[PDB]
Amino acid sequence: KTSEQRVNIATLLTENKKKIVDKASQDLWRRHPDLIAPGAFSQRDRALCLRDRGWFLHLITFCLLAGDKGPIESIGLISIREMYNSLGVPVPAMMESIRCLKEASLSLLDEEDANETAPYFDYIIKAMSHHH
């Protein structure tokens, strides 16, 4: 399913958007501590990486609202290109970050919603995976 279902899920991912970005950031840094190590070490560069993580979640919930994966093809691609060019973020790092966001988001949902939700995450991963 319903337009109520989409809104139900979107309001969940909005309300808990900080719990998700936090969870997903810890999962990322436990799994890949070389990002948080001296070799996202700086507070300004770690802030941008967190800013960019929250942005991907926003983009997902939007696509969930719209029932549509076209925004990923439109503004998603623009932003992922702008990341590795200007900010030098590696493709494996972004792909893994979105896997961590996926996991954390889905933990709040039930199996009916999570099945409806999971492909939106996967679509961004697939749309990046072709590069590296």
Ligand X SMILES: *C(=C)C1=C(C)C(Cc2[nH]c(Cc3[nH]c(CC4=NC(=O)[C@H](C)[C@H]4C=C)c(C)c3CCC(=O)O)c(CCC(=O)O)c2C)=NC1=O
Residues near a copy of itself (CB under 8 A) are 2-4, 6-7, 10-11, 14-15, 51, 54-55, 58-59, 61-62, 65-66, 68, 70-71, 74-75, 78-79, 82
d(CA 39, CA 36): 8
Determine if 94 is a binding residue for ligand X (CB under 6 A).
yes
Which of the choices ligand X, a copy of itself, none does residue 93 contact, using the CB cut-off of 5 to 8 A by kind? ligand X
Residue span 57-86 as binding mask against ligand X, x where in contact by CB under 6 A, dash where not: --x-----------x--xx--xx--xx--x
d(CA 126, CA 10): 22
Q: Give the count of alpha carbons within 13 A of 4, CB side only.
A: 0
For the chain, the helix, strand and coil percentages under 3-state DSSP, each to the nearest 5: 80, 0, 20
State the nearest-atom distance from the C-beta of 104 to ligand X, in Å. 13
- Amino acid at the residue 81: R
**Which one among 56, 60, 100, 104 touches ligand X, defined by CB under 6 A?**
56
